[PDB]
Every structure is written in C-alpha cells, then in structure tokens.
Amino acid sequence: QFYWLDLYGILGENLDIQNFLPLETSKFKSLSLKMIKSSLSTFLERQRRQFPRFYFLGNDDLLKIIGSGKHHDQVSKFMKKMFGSIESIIFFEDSITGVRSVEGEVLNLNEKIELKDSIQAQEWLNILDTEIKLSVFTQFRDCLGQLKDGTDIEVVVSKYIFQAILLSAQVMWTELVEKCLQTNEFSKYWKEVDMKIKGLLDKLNKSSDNVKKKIEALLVEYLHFNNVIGQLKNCSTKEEARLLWAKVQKFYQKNDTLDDLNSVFISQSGYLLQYKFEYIGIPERLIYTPLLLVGFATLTDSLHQKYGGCFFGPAGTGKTETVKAFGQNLGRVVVVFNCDDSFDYQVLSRLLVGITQIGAWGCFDEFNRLDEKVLSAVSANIQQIQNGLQVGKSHITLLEEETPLSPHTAVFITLNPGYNGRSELPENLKKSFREFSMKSPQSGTIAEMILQIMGFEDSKSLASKIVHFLELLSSKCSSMNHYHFGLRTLKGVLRNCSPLVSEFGEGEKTVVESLKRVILPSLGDTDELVFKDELSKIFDSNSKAIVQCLKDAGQRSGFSMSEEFLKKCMQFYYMQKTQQALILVGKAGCGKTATWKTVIDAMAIFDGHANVVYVIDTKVLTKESLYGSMLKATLEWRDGLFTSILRRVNDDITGTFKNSRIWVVFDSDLDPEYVEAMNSVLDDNKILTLPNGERLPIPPNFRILFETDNLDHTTPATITRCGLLWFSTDVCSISSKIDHLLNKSYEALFELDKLKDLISDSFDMASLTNIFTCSNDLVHILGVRTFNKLETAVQLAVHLISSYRQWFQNLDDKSLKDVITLLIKRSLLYALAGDSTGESQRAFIQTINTYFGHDSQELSDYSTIVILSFSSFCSEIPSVSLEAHEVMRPDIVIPTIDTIKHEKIFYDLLNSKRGIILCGPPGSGKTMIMNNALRNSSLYDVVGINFSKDTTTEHILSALHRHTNYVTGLTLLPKSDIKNLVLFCDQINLPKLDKYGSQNVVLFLRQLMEKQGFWKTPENKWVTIERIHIVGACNPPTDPGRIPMSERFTRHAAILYLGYPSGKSLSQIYEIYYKAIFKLVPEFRSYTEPFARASVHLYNECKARYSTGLQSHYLFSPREL
Amino acid sequence: LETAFLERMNTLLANADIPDLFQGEEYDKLLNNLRNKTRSLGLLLDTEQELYDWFVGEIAKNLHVVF
Amino acid sequence: KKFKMIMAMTMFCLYKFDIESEQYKEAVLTMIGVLSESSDGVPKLTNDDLRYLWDYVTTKSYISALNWFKNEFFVDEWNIADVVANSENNYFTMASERDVDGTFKLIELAKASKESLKIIPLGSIENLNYAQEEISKSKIEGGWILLQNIQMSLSWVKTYLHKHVEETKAAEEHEKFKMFMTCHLTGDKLPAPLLQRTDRVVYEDIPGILDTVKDLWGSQGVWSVYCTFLLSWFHALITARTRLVPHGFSKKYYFNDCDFQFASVYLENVLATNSTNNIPWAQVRDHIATIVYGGKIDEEKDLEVVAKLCAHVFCGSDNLQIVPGVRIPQPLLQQSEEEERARLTAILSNTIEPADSLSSWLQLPRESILDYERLQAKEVASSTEQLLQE
Ligand SMILES: Nc1ncnc2c1ncn2[C@@H]1O[C@H](COP(=O)(O)OP(=O)(O)OP(=O)(O)O)[C@@H](O)[C@H]1O
Ligand SMILES: Nc1ncnc2c1ncn2[C@@H]1O[C@H](COP(=O)(O)OP(=O)(O)OP(=O)(O)O)[C@@H](O)[C@H]1O
Ligand SMILES: Nc1ncnc2c1ncn2[C@@H]1O[C@H](COP(=O)(O)OP(=O)(O)OP(=O)(O)O)[C@@H](O)[C@H]1O
Prior knowledge:
This is part of a larger assembly, with three copies of chain A.
Chain A: H1 2-12, H2 22-30, H3 33-38, H4 41-49, H5 59-67, H6 74-77, H7 79-82, E1 86-91, E2 95-101, E3 106-114, H8 121-149, H9 162-181, H10 187-204, H11 209-233, H12 238-247, E4 250-253, E5 264-268, E6 271-274, H13 290-304, E7 308-312, H14 319-329, E8 335-338, H15 345-358, E9 361-365, H16 372-377, H17 379-391, E10 395-398, E11 401-404, E12 410-415, H18 427-430, E13 433-437, H19 443-453, H20 459-476, H21 487-497, H22 501-504, H23 508-519, H24 525-538, H25 544-557, H26 563-578, E14 581-586, H27 592-607, E15 610-616, H28 623-626, E16 629-631, E17 636-638, H29 641-651, E18 660-667, H30 672-675, H31 679-682, E19 687-689, E20 695-697, E21 702-708, H32 716-719, E22 723-727, H33 734-748, H34 751-762, H35 765-775, H36 790-803, H37 813-833, H38 838-852, E23 863-866, E24 869-872, H39 897-911, E25 915-919, H40 926-935, E26 940-946, H41 953-959, E27 964-967, E28 970-974, E29 980-986, H42 1000-1011, E30 1013-1016, E31 1021-1025, E32 1028-1034, H43 1047-1050, E33 1053-1057, H44 1063-1077, H45 1088-1105
Parallel strand pairs in A: 7-12, 7-13, 8-9, 9-12, 14-21, 14-22, 15-18, 18-21, 25-32, 25-33, 26-29, 28-31, 29-32
Antiparallel strand pairs in A: 1-2, 2-3, 4-5, 5-6, 10-11, 16-17, 19-20, 23-24, 27-28, 30-31
One adenosine-5'-triphosphate binds near residues 923 and 928 of chain A.
C-alpha cells in the first residue's frame, strides 16, 4: 500500500496543486504511480522559486515539506539545511515562538507567528525569515543601549544572544577607541579593556554551556580589542596611529536614519560594507592575526566593486575559514561548496542561480578541481553576475531563465595551485577575481591566544615551545611525504589538550601528551627517536581498562597480542577519539585490518555501543557509483554507495544509530580524484555537498578509515586533514602468525585434538626459522615476501593432513609422525619455493630435509602417499596409446611425470580453497594443465575469461551471467547446486594502469577473494559469494606489455611456476605423437624416432636463431611442434 | 575505429562467443532459437548448458577470421 | 617581440644589401656577427648610421642596437585598432601567451567604434549552440561577436567554423559584421585552412617604459589627474621590472589593467575625503603595496621590492625625481584640470628614455641586466644571420 499512500499524501489530498498539476491530479484519481511521482519536478521548481533557500533541499525533501503543512514537523527538520545556523523551529500553541541554533542557543521572536493549514511553507517561512532579522536587530539595539548606558559586560552576556552582545561590544569599542584616537590618552582605556578581559576570563570558570561558549567568543574579540588598543597606545606619531587605525574594521551605526535593519555598517580602508543582521548562532571564532586582517582588507576591496573574492596558497593555511569569519563579522553566513569534476556548466549555473536568488554569499572550495572546459564556460555567468551587481540590474538570465538578482550576493573562490589533479583558471576568468596570497599563518599568536582562552597558567611560554618544537620537527625529521607540522597539526594538538586538562593540570604535561598522541603515530623509527629527543630537549617534563579490552578482543579473535600490535592498537584508539578521519599506511600484510578491527571490538566491549562497519573499495567503484550521479536527461539524482550510506544514517528511521558508531572503510589506494570530493566532509565543515544542491550533514559519530600502503599520489589536502597511523614493520613475528593461521585452519574443521597436537609439534619453530631464512635467498618469479607466503603453507598443510583422517585411526605413532612430516614438508616446499624454477625447487627440498632433521621422513622430488604407505609419482606414470585421428584433438595430454606433479599440486591447492596464479613462459602448458586437471573432475565447472588492456569489471561480471543466479544481503550462487565454479582469468596482468598506477580489475579480483563478495552498484547492495573460486594465469612480469601486480593482490594466492619441458621431454612427447600418426602408413614406422628428433631439433634451432631482437613477433614455443 | 573493437576481436578468438552480445533477454531468445534449431536437426538438448555448448562449438567450427 | 625584431633586421638587410654598396653590406654583416657573438670585428666607418649602431654595440646598448634597424628603416607601425579599422577581412584571430589576454582591447575598441560587442566563451555545448545562433544573427543583422578560448572546442573549430568562414569568404554582403577569436600561442594547433582566412594579431605588452606610461596616460580636480599620472608611472615601472625574472623579482609575476584600475579607484576614493590637501600618502603607499599589487605577491623579498617602489613614487614630495630624467612638481590648486593635464602631458612628452633605462630607471645593477639584454640580442642576431645565409 506504500506507493499509493506516498503519492496520495503528496498529490492526492491536495486540491491547490492541481492548478499547476491538473494532468497528474487526474491521472492519480484514475490510478504508473512512480512515473507520476517523477513527473512533479516542474511543480517543485515552481515552489523553489517562491522560497530561494529551497534550492538546498532535494526533491524528496520538497515533497515532504510541501505535503506536511498540517503538522509543521518536517519543516523544522530542514532548518539545518535551509539556514545552516539554525537547528530547529520552536513551536507553541500552533505558533512559532522561536528558533534553536546548532549550538543550542534559543532566539525568541518579537511576535509569535500564527500558523494556519492554508498557509504554505514558503509563505510563513518568508515571514519567519523577516522576523528572525527583526529579532536579531532588536536584541542588538537593546544590548547596545544597556552597554552604552554603563552596564557591565558580565551582566549582559547572560541576557542576550551572542550576535547582539558581540555587535554591541564592537560598536562601543569602535566609538571609544576613536575618541581615544582624538588624543594620546590610550593608557586608561587599555587598562579598562584589560580589566574587562580579566573579569570575563574569571567568569568563564563559573558558567553554563551556552554562557561558556559566549564568554569564550567574547574573550577572542576582546583579546583582539586589547591587542589593537595596545598597538595604538605604542605608536610614535599621530599619523602612525591614524594609519594603523584605518586598517582595522570599524563598526558604525547610522543613528540618524529611519531604516533599522540597514543602520549598521562596517568601515575598512575607506570602503564601507553593509551589515545584514542574519542569525548565525554561536560559531567558533577565529583568533585575530595580521594575515586575517589583511585578508579581510582584500575581501572588502573586492566587494566594493562587486568583484569575486579569491584566496590561493598552499594547503592548510586557513583560507576557507578566513572567508567564513569574514562572513560572520558581517552578520551573514557563507554557503560553502566543494567543487569537483562531476560539476559541469549546468551544475555551476544552477548553484549560481541559487546563490543569486537567495541573496547569499557562496564560497567555492577547491575551485581548481573544475575541469578546464567548465572553467572557460562559466566565465560568462560570472561576468554577467558582476555586471548585474555593478550596474544595478534587477534580473539576470541564467540557463535561459530570467531570475531576480538579490543585491546582497558575493562569490568567493579558494584554490590550491600546483597540486595533483588540479587545473588552471583561464585568464578571462581570473580577471574577474581579486587574488590574495595566504602562504604562512601566524601560528605563534594563534597558539598563545588559544592557550590563554583555555586557562593555562603560562600561555606565552607554552605557545613559544609548541611552535618552536613543531618547527624543529619539520626541520629535523627524515625526508618523507607525510610530514606536515603546520597549522592543522597545531590545532590537533591544542584540541587534544582540551579533554586532558583535568588529567594533567593546565600545564606542560597536557601539552606533551597531546604532542605525543598527535605526532608519534605518524613517524618512523628515526623520526620517533628525533621526536623523543627534541621533546626532551625543549620541554621540561592509566589505560588499564582499554588495555584489557584490547587483550580480550585480540585473544578472542585469535590474534597474538604482540607488543608492537598492542602499541599500534593504543595509538589508533587514542587517535580516533578526536579524529573522524584516519589513514592507516603500511606494507601489504602488515596488519592494518587486524589493528582497526581489534580496536573497534575492544571499544564495543568497553562502551557497550554497537558498531556497524561498511567496507568500500574506492578504486573498483567509479565515482558515479560511489558518490552518486544526476541523470540530466531527467534531472533525477540517484545516490551512490557512500551517499546512500550517509543519507540512511542521517534519516535514522528506527533510531538504530543513536547508540552506535558508523564506520566507513575505504579499502584501496588513496586517489586525489576520489578522496578530495570528501574534503568538506573530512575537515571542520563536516558537510557532504552533492552537485544537485543537497547538503548532507556528517553525524558526530560517523567515522571514516582509509587503508592503503602508499602516499605517492596523495596530496597534502588529504594528508593534513586526516590523522595518520604509520606501520613501519609487520605487527607480529612469524611464529605468532603461524600460531594464528594454524588455529584458524584447525577451528574451521578427540581425533582432531591429538592431530592438532601432532601438527603443532611438527611446525616446530626451531627448523622453520632456518628454512625461511634460506628460502629468502631463492629467485622468485612474480614473488611475494615470506611473511605473505605462510598462509599457503598452513592452509594447504591442514587440508592435506585432514584429508587422510579416514586412515589415521589404525596407524601407529611412527606412521602418523611420518605422514604429517612428509605432508608438511611438501606443503612448505610449494608455499615457499613454488614460484621458483625446477633446480631451485630441488635444492630447496635438500635444505628442507637438512633442517627438519636426518631422522625425519625424507621428502624427495616425486614422493607421495598412497592407500597407508609411501611411494613416488615416478613409478605411477601410465603409457598412452593414441589413434592417428586423436592427434587432432584439443583435449589430449600425453602423460609424463612433470605433468602429473603439476596436476596433483594444482588440484590439492584448489581443494584447500586457496586462489591460484599460474606463471610461466608462453606455450609452457598452463591452460592445458589446468584444463586437463579439471576435465576429469566431478566437483567443478570451469568458466574462462580472457583479460586484455581495455577490459573492466563489467566483462568479468557478464562472464558469469549464464552460470550464476542472484538469490536473496544478497548472494551469488552457481546455477548448478552440485558443482562449484572455477573462474579462470587468462593473462591476468595485461590490464593497463590508470593515470595513478592502479588496476581496477585486479583490485576487483582482490575484493572477490578477500571479502568473498562485492558491491552491486545500481542498487548499492552487498553481494556475498558462496561457491566460486578464482584461478588465473599470466606470463612473467618481464615480457613486453605486462603490468606488475601489487603485493596486496598476489598475497591472497599461491603462485606456481611452470617452465618449458626439457629437450628429452619434448622428444619423447612428440615421438609418441609421430608413433600415433604412422599408424596411417605403418611401413614407415621405423622412422618415428628420427622424424621426432628432426622436428624438435628444428624447433630448438629456430627458437634460438630467430629471436625477438630481430622482429617483435618472432616468438617460438612448443605450440609450433 | 576504437580500441573497443579489438576487445571484441580478441574475445571472439580467445573464446568462441562474445558474452556481452547475449545478455538478459538476448540470452533467452538465443536459447529459444537454439531449441528451435535443435528441434529442426533431430537433436535432443534439454538444458541451457547443452544448448550453449552446441552453439559455441558450431561457432568455432564455422567462423573463420582473416586479419 | 622576438620575431618582430628578427623580421625588422632581416628586411633592413634584404633591402640595403642590394641597394647600398658592398662596404655598407660588409659593415652590416660584421655588426650582425658582433651581436650574435658568432664573430668579432670592427666595421669600416667613414656611414654615420652604422657609426651610431657602432656606438650602441660598443657601449653594450644591445636593445638599442636591435632597435636601430627598426627605427632607421621603418617609419610606421600598427596596433590592434589600426589592423581592425583598416582591413578588407571581417574575421580576426588574436593570440597571446598564458596570463596575457587582450579581451579588454577589443571591448575598448568596440566602445570607441560605438559597436555592440557580445562575448561568448567556448568549451561547452550550451555556449556552442548559443554561439551558432548569435553568429547567424550578427550577419543578417550586424554586430561584433567574440569567441573566447576557441582551442577549448577544437572539434567545433575544425567543423562548423572551418565551414562558415568559407561561406562568408563567399557572401561579403553585410558591412556591420566582425567576428573575433582568441587563442593561446602555447596551446594546441588551429587548422591551417581557418587561420589562413583570418586576420591574425599577436597581443603582447609594450616593451618600453616611457612608451607604457605614454599609452596609459593617453587612455585617460588637479589632484585626480596628478595621482593618475603618478600611478601610470608606477604601473609602467613595476611592469618593466617584471621583465628581469632573475634580478627584478624573485618569481615571475604579471600585472594588468585591473590592478591599475583598482589603484585608480582607491586613489580617487582617498582624494574624495581629504579636501584639506593632507593626502594620507602613507595609506596610499600601504594599500597599493599590500592589497592592489601585493595580493599577487607570495614572497617577502618581492613584496619588499614592491614596497620600495611605492615609497619611491608615492612619497608626497614637492618635486619627485621619479626617474633620473623627468622631475614631477606637485600641482597648484589654483590651476584648472585641463591646465594640469596639459602640464603633465608636456612633462611626459618632453623627455627621452635613455639607452640604459633598464638600469637607471629601475635601479638595477648594470652587470645584471647585461646578460639579459645581450642574450636577447644574441638570439635575435643569430636567427637573422641564419636567415640571411639562406
Ligand atoms: N585565526 C585563527 N584562529 C584559529 N584557528 C585558525 C585561525 N586561522 C586558521 N585557523 C585554523 O586553520 C584551519 C582552517 O583551514 P581551512 O579548512 O580553511 O583550510 P584550507 O586552506 O581550506 O585547506 P585546503 O587547501 O586543504 O582545502 C583550522 O585549523 C582553523 O582552526
Ligand atoms: N597479532 C597478530 N598475531 C598473529 N597473526 C596476525 C596478527 N596481526 C595480523 N596477523 C596476520 O597477518 C595478516 C594481517 O593482514 P590483514 O588482514 O590485517 O591485512 P593488511 O596487513 O592490512 O593487508 P591489506 O592492505 O593487503 O589488506 C593476516 O594473516 C593476519 O592473520
Ligand atoms: N604431454 C604434453 N606435455 C607437454 N606439452 C604438451 C603435451 N601434449 C601437448 N603439449 C603441447 O604443449 C603446449 C602447451 O601450451 P599451451 O598451448 O597450453 O599454452 P598456454 O599455457 O595456454 O600459454 P600462454 O600463457 O601463452 O597462453 C601445446 O603445444 C600442447 O600441444
């Protein structure tokens, strides 16, 4: 009954919209419902025109706001999107009595707004917008009146909203300082402002939450007042005093006019700006520094002539927040957008239409990320807006529609030049903006003032030491990309000092603990030593519960709690308290996943909160699947995976997310064309901006983790926003990893309990150490580190030993030890030296036999176990008798010992459920051996894919269309319910690298193996894979055109090297073939040997003689024979 | 004209079929056609696996490509 | 710039070598060898123009040595307005390097011509379709149309445009139509067919200091004109300083008409509220150094250079020695605006920019600018010598 009720509440029970939707009204009466619902966009646009702020609401949001005009519940919920500074509407007696800000401040209205069912949302919302402007002005008027009369600052802060008290204080400060400027008497007024600062600072310690916030912001403003007054007091001449005073912002009121809301204006450098009296709440205020003031000066100069404002410079210098603070000072709130390459002419034009009609100030962040074409195209609209404002036009035409121009707007751009993935503005667009460099903020003043606000005993000394220490670290640490000790690091330190004030006592101890927690997790060994030494040089001087939670979580999951592992868990745990964005960087297999899963599970134990975690593979997904996309053909927005998750969390229909944490893990390489889209999500804005105009907030408990192994193509824009955890080395030893792997393999399985003891004793660490140590010296084709090859050893050994359980009950102890020993030796051989050549494998067998002990069961080239007794493959090779015509068959394999060995090990690996990669020269028989092995089986069907340069995930999924079913997360099963699927991947290493050096298809295969599933993009759902295995083959990564595959992929699969057969082998095989042929002409069968010899000789000499150094296509292989 | 063309001609010779040409209902129709053709030849192929195997085998038999 | 000097020298030689005697020819060839650093020697001087050239070369007046040829032979030189006003064509292609754009030259042109100029940037389908419609209209009806950054949409330059231009090669039947195109000399290739049928103009800065201030002054109560004159000198001097990339400013920068315009607006705003003639010169210096021009500057050294130039120009002295040549007295409030404009114009026009203005007027070391100037002369002379050999 859902769809009818949904469109009935929207379209059915409404006889006013029929004058604009008569067709849909009649169509609904007859009733297809979905198509009608998608056909209401024209009316929604009509309603957006009647209240410009509606441009920040999605179509569903407008449907809800238009529908529930009889309840006024849904309209409140959108205040955060429509006004930004306002959280909700405070109703009473079917009338509006006030509004509630984000920080919790309550603004009362001068008059209650009576509401009716007949009054539409846009109507009484316009009334509310005018009333909010009037109420803010009224409180400003009264507060300035009382303060000017001589009321104390401390008895007015508790009566009025923040804006009234701030602006009254500013106007009085301007007037009184100008009167002091009339003469040389600044000492008395400096002392007065100092006394006010002391009074407010002491009052701060005895306050409620709102009063605390108000006093902190006023202290920021009064510290600026005192700094300015002191500078003027210390000028030499009158002209110096006038010169300094002209450069700061002055707050004047037109006390001689009739227009109330426009009575206040701001003077700077001879130019005037108009104060708006828009309600902004109690935002965090910025400490005043010379750079901030000069930025304000340039913005004022640009706005005088209606030119677009612009800030440029390196990342992490405070451009966007300078813009926001300027807006805050002018009594208005700036709307911030995060530009991306998903924007084009239509998106930017629509956003400009919204900003134009609203009368708002808009800031476009990361403006360089727009592609060149749209940067050129939108210059016309930018110029039209500038000309309309300068001339005084009443309307402008955008996207073929004439719209009113509200004469309050402004466009600001913030851009970071010279970063990967950024572009360059064309000249005819740059000429419409006034640029200002923001290269270096005054970090010392910021640190001193923040510490003074926080009540630390000595702000000057601590600020000096902190900033000097950060400079020393930036000067002394090793040369690595992820070393940034700029302003964002200072803010991280200072913010972490806040919860630790009562832990250590408002002194150096808090500062040093914050420094350690912020900085140490991102350093290496050398830089860790440098940090500790420098901290000891510059600075003068109980976790048990969470430690035990970590111990319990690790042991329960089964991971050894090594000292390094616990250290990294503790650092991650402390970092995530205040960081909503963490990056974990370490080598493949080092234990990032173990670290964050263990810490979240320990936190779940500690707090009792639920933890829902989503794992997204950024590179496998395209951006239009990850962040969603608008279909311009219908102008319909359709969510991507991340956008869908965020929307669902924000909706919280059942309240399921109120006592839980939401974790989103991006398990792939950082890519500046993906991650930068989330810049305004990761930093202080905490907002996701979509191209369609929606603005989705980020909940306080919504955390994002990035997992990767490099920071090569990642810019400071991401590194300096996210807290970084660096894994120098693997978190555990080989013994611990073997213990974990063996426990997991065993637990997956009386008899098994004694067999476990036998197996564990067999994996005696003593000899395995030397075996690994001398295994490290072999040549490994397409190799992997020993640490990531242990998994194959343990898994295959457990599978092989358990396969013989049926015949262990009747064996003596020596027999059991011998079978276990031989199986473990063979598994270890193939796990460590499987990707080496034959001679290397035989020498490695020799070393294995040496180190396991002379008295242990010997492993030999072709040893095996038969039903128990010990035998060899070399005695079990049958002959083949072919008929002549059967030489034309594709499915004939003449048996031989080397073939039997490959087939046996391949089938054993496949049964153990280890993904397989075959590697060897062309024609060596990879596909043939893999086809012959599975041809005679009854457990597996085979599906083959041929990979190439321009194949994608779509081809891989389409290859399984006729073999698999989607069965309700969702599951993907083979159509047959008796056999599994083996999905061959031919030439897995050909697919080319993208512009940043990644293979999306290989990452997709990694996701299929590791997570046993994937994301279905159109529906954004999780699909679990049950009975599909992954095998593949490639040539070695030395032939032309082959792309090396990352260790994060190859670690999940056993690698077997297949070389060419020896000369005698080819001679024998093809002598058998010629013997088969000569049945046609038996009178020449005496020549079977010399013909085969001639063919093999000719092949060998052609291969040696005509090499690829002559022509690229001179490839010779046994195929020719 | 495009590299995508190669991606077809590679597949067509790496395997008898091009799976992208017979997705969704296009697959269903193919099987139906095969069934009719199967009935027209006096052959008994019941399942989609048998029919598709016959299809690809005939393709490998009959189609020759000259570059 | 470079190719204009190469052409000037080349044509001078092509004419004189066959017109004049052999000794004249051998002297000029010796001189080109000197400038190119390919050969030493002294011409035979008995021939005062060759002598004057010889004075410049010895004295290391290398840019003067190049300008000798152009000044001696050629007696005329055209600008953008000259080309557009005097042309049988109605399609025009303007080209420049990065961070240089002459759109304002065309807008000033169109206003002076009392023509309606519509400007459309290309790069998107919306602007392309609108541009096609508006191209059709400005032909049946008339008007000026400018297509900016055509290289952004070559797939349309090489199809529709490569076509309509040949069609209008044919019609030549409407007198009030002109299409303008802009492109970058450092960008992609435009199709030869289309460039061949279009009047091509290269836009670049004026090389001379005195020339730059003269042009700026010609583009334009006594305090208003006086401050405008000082600002014109300042703009010319700073723009000239930007040419010495390794000696003038640490980093390469560009200054354009918008910085001049903002400085002019601020100066007028200051003069509006200081009727006592107590001009806040310190505020003028700080604003121009820090905001109007300093906003582009991201280095302390370069900003200090800007501050020095501001302190030199806007000092407020009774008679400023703005260069080693002209001295600029302050105005008399008893004089008329036209009178003061005439006096300032006379001060400007009566002086001479010396051969070594790169040093004396910019106060740079003479050994630093020598490498710059000599290497430019070397490249020009080497190219000319190669062309003359062929
Ligand atoms: N006066 C100030 N007082 C307090 N904090 C400040 C001040 N100025 C800047 N900051 C700090 O600077 C940071 C704001 O930087 P912002 O988010 O604007 O960076 P950005 O230049 O936009 O970055 P990017 O180039 O990476 O996009 C915050 O840490 C803010 O606290
Ligand atoms: N403390 C530990 N004790 C024993 N084994 C451990 C421990 N920590 C990790 N391991 C093992 O080491 C490997 C760790 O890999 P994990 O799944 O954490 O991914 P990773 O190292 O982040 O790699 P990738 O980025 O490729 O996914 C697993 O085999 C895990 O069993
Ligand atoms: N008993 C046998 N032992 C070894 N080789 C044999 C035997 N019987 C046939 N061959 C030949 O060995 C060659 C095996 O190479 P195959 O065609 O399988 O290459 P491939 O593994 O698919 O190679 P690529 O990686 O280049 O695609 C074929 O010529 C096959 O005819």
